[PDB]
Design a binder for these strands. Structure first.
Ligand SMILES: [Mg+2]
Ligand SMILES: [Mg+2]
Ligand SMILES: [Mg+2]
Ligand SMILES: [Mg+2]
Ligand SMILES: [Mg+2]
Ligand SMILES: [Mg+2]
Ligand SMILES: [Mg+2]
Ligand SMILES: [Mg+2]
Ligand SMILES: [Mg+2]
Ligand SMILES: [Mg+2]
Ligand SMILES: [Mg+2]
Ligand SMILES: [Mg+2]
Ligand SMILES: [Mg+2]
Ligand SMILES: [Mg+2]
Ligand SMILES: [Mg+2]
Ligand SMILES: [Mg+2]
Ligand SMILES: [Mg+2]
Ligand SMILES: [Mg+2]
Ligand SMILES: [Mg+2]
Ligand SMILES: [Zn+2]
Lengths: 307, 59, 110, 115, 153
RNA sequence: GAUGUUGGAUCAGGACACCCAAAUGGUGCAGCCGCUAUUAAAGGUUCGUUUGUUCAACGAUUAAAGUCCUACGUGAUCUGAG
RNA sequence: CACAAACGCGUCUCAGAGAUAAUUAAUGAUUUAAUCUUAACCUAAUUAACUCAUAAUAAAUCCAGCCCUAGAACAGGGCACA
């Protein structure tokens, strides 16, 4: 038995190719809109807010960057993060993860069934969601737990707050020493021969080995990084778009991990936020289409006059 | 009951366990008191580990 | 830098018999429904493309004869004919290439 | 960005500014820890074989949007007291300079046109 | 680094690249199908597409005419571009070129080759990949599902 | 039957007999500077004119512009003014 | 900046707790006063390191092709809409 390679679309005919697609997308919209109502389904017990609590996070899409002006006249540049499809996936009890905090696994953007693994499609069939592209694990306290297969919207971070972002930084491949590290070069013109880039002496004569940490040319930039202490300026409710401050590591259009700030200055800031998470059903109110921080100049306004 | 080890004399204070990570400036020295504070198993484990013959069967 | 020691045949067997330097077994090979020769799944059949190619070459020769010189090329659409065929009205007003071989089964009339 | 060895042009009306010399006045030292000076930074000028202190007024390097960018690098002659050794400054000065009153007070007081 | 770049570097430089494409495009507009290196066929694809989009702009447009001058070397071909090759594409927006991969060349070089062709040329039909027919056990098995989705609606 | 030798360039590993930053004792310490001594090596320790020059002088500054070792570190990485 | 990108001269973001060194003090014996003690018991005050809270990563196996902000090769992410 020499078994052949098979992809999903190999044996389908002209007739059946669109049918399969229409069918899969149909079942997808159905399964999505079905999970659209968490609170009336089989909601888990909601717990009050204690001071040592830690919230759930979000998975976003980096759109691009845009300028934004404060009422004070200063100009900030901000990054638009969008929440496309966000659902909590599985749940790990306290003892079963860190011995300390409970793991909540969150899914990202929707992909096609046809290219994933058997095991994974099994995992989503026992859930009822479409497969998510990027899946990250958040650490969370017992009072912040949610129920697996629950939707997470972008109103989750109320405007003004500090968040943290983790993502894979822009990959630059195999880079020389002057990029990767930032060693000065050798001078260009004075009779230097074939040296204008190279690291130069890499060690000491006695040691006769080169040390286990030594900086050398190599892989640069595809790695995880985290930006701390970013302020959130404004929120869009309809398109689910956060405007965070400064820059977020990754290429634009990349998938990005958002949490509340773990920085020591902000420790208790989570007392004012909708805590298990935000629930559009529960409040039964329409949030204004944009939530602005008190500082921001709104896209329409008096056109500032100092005095 | 490893955590309840006794050390004769003043050894708790003056016996040092040294370790090196290999990176320049990766040289650590810990007092027996501190090492016993961090890892309750560590002291008896390093005691025993140094008393077996040095061949592979030690591992 | 000059190698400090001859390497043993042991070390060489290790290096150049590595699973990476071995030729991988291609699993995408199939047979072509017409001539039953072998072809890779994503590539055209070699043997089929051959008879197609030969016929294209010959029809290009005869249409090279229907043209007088290097720079002179037809403004009409062309339609190629085979023994026993007469032009349809859809195809008339066009340049016609006449050929001896009766129209090959794989080339349709349309 | 005005740095060591930049030729600067002295805008205020002073003895040392207008009188000719075989050397164009050169900047020796900038007092920022960065070797680069900006508008409202402080320089040590070599003029006519002696050292005077100066205040950078405008420069040819671009700066944050809505800052005026000038055709030439312009300095005002200044002593240690922070007193401008000049009477007045004709060519226009960045309005941003009014931010710091403390150090530049007198310099601002003798300034004619702002932009 | 290479990030976000839509052009290969082929031949002795940028100019050499344009002239390589020139030759290929002349060949393609003349013979209506050519077999060339896969990198270069795939490169030619875009230009072969948009050259037909100038043909549609009309014979009278000047910007199209000086364009046809640069890109079609053999001068006879230019009336072929406007009067022949442009008019037979009308309804079809982007559907001009078929590009398919041939077995690798038989010479010691062993490159990776492709044939590129205009739709509707009069040449023997290329032995295109066939789709599995509908009587196939699996496709026949899907028909049931379709008819049941029709029966439920 | 060769361990290629000064000074720079690049990249620095280490000591502490601390030049800065950090806690302190004593003063012929009122405070401001200081002058001495103890404990502390994670991090720093500038740019120029003249000399091949390390050293040194001199201009301008800095919180400081340490003393050393590593084949007077480092030429199968570079430079040869000497 | 003649590429859709790269890039600086441009923009953003930067941390809790625990320990101790030298030295200051409280109760207090040998020696019933005294006495910080190489005497107990609790102690207190105070650098740097150095630990660690916290953060990253963390779904075993379809992978022919073809795209890519992922790449030297192999790896990695896409290919249902639309
Ligand atoms: Mg890359
Ligand atoms: Mg350089
Ligand atoms: Mg050179
Ligand atoms: Mg040479
Ligand atoms: Mg003089
Ligand atoms: Mg590319
Ligand atoms: Mg080439
Ligand atoms: Mg392509
Ligand atoms: Mg020898
Ligand atoms: Mg060093
Ligand atoms: Mg000391
Ligand atoms: Mg040091
Ligand atoms: Mg030496
Ligand atoms: Mg030397
Ligand atoms: Mg050497
Ligand atoms: Mg007593
Ligand atoms: Mg007492
Ligand atoms: Mg840790
Ligand atoms: Mg994949
Ligand atoms: Zn065939």
């Amino acid at each position: 038995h020499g078994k052949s390679v098979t992809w999903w679309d190999e044996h389908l005919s002209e007739e059946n190719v669109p049918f399969v697609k229409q069918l899969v997308s149909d079942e997808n919209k159905a399964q999505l809109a079905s999970k659209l109502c968490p609170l009336k389904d089989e909601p888990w017990p909601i717990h009050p807010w204690e001071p040592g609590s830690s919230r759930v996070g979000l998975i976003a899409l980096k759109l691009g960057m845009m300028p934004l002006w404060t009422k004070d006249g200063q100009k900030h540049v901000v990054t638009l993060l969008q929440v496309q499809d966000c659902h909590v996936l599985k749940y790990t009890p306290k003892e079963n993860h860190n011995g300390r905090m409970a793991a909540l696994t969150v899914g990202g953007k929707t992909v096609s069934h046809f290219h994933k693994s058997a095991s994974i499609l099994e995992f989503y069939q026992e859930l009822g969601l479409p497969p998510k592209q990027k899946v990250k694990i958040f650490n969370v306290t017992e009072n912040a737990v949610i129920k697996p297969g629950t939707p997470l919207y972008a109103a989750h971070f109320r405007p003004g707050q500090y968040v943290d972002v983790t993502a894979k930084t822009i990959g630059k491949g195999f880079q020389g020493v002057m990029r990767r590290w930032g060693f000065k070069g050798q001078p260009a013109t004075h009779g230097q021969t074939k040296t204008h880039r190279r690291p130069g002496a890499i060690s000491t004569g006695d040691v006769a080995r080169v040390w286990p940490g030594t900086k050398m040319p190599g892989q640069l930039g595809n790695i995880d990084r985290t930006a701390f202490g970013l302020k959130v300026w404004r929120i869009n409710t309809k398109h689910n778009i956060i405007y965070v401050n400064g820059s977020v590591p990754g290429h634009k259009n990349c998938l990005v991990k958002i949490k509340d700030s773990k920085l020591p200055a902000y420790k208790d800031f989570c007392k004012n936020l909708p805590f298990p998470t935000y629930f559009p059903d529960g409040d039964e109110e329409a949030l204004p289409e944009d939530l602005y921080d008190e500082n921001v100049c709104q896209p329409g306004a008096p056109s500032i006059t100092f005095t | 009951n490893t955590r309840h080890i006794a050390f004769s004399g003043n050894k708790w204070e003056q016996k040092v366990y040294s370790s090196h990570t290999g990176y320049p400036g990766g040289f650590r020295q810990v007092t027996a008191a501190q090492l016993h504070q961090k890892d309750p198993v560590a002291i008896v484990k390093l005691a025993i580990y140094g008393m077996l013959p040095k061949n592979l069967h030690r591992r | 830098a000059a190698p400090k020691n001859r390497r043993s045949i042991e070390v060489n067997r290790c290096r150049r018999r590595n699973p990476q330097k071995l030729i991988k077994v291609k699993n995408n090979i199939d047979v072509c429904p017409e001539c039953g020769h072998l072809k890779q799944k994503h590539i055209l059949c070699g043997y089929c493309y051959e008879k197609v190619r030969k016929e294209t070459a010959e029809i290009r020769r005869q249409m090279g004869k229907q043209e007088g010189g290097p720079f002179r090329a037809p403004t009409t659409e062309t339609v190629v004919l085979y023994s026993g065929e007469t032009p349809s009205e859809q195809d008339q007003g066009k340049r016609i290439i006449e050929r001896e071989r009766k129209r090959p089964s794989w080339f349709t009339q349309n | 960005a005005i740095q060591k060895m930049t030729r600067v042009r002295v805008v205020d009306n002073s003895a040392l500014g207008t009188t000719p010399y075989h050397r164009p006045p050169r900047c020796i030292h900038v007092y920022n820890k960065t070797g680069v000076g900006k508008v409202g930074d402080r320089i040590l000028l070599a003029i006519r074989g002696q050292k005077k202190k100066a205040l950078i007024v405008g420069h040819r390097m671009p700066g944050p949007r809505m800052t005026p960018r000038f055709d030439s690098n312009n300095v005002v002659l200044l002593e240690d007291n922070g007193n401008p050794v000049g009477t007045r400054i004709k060519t226009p000065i960045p309005s941003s300079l009014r931010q710091r009153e403390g150090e530049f007070s007198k310099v601002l007081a003798i300034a004619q046109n702002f932009v | 680094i290479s990030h976000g770049r839509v052009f290969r570097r082929l031949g002795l430089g940028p100019e050499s690249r344009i002239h390589l494409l020139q030759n290929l495009l002349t060949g393609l507009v003349r013979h209506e199908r050519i077999e060339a290196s896969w990198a270069r066929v795939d490169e030619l694809r875009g230009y072969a597409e948009k050259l037909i989009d100038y043909g549609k702009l009309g014979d009278t447009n000047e910007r199209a005419m000086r364009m046809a001058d640069f890109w079609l070397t053999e001068k006879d071909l230019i009336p072929k571009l406007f009067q022949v090759l442009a008019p037979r594409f009308q309804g079809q927006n982007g559907g001009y070129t078929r590009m398919l991969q041939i077995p690798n060349r038989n010479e010691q070089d062993r490159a990776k080759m492709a044939v590129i062709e205009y739709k509707g040329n009069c040449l023997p039909p290329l032995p295109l990949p066939r789709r599995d027919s509908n009587l196939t056990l699996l496709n026949q098995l899907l028909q049931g599902l379709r008819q049941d989705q029709e029966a439920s609606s």
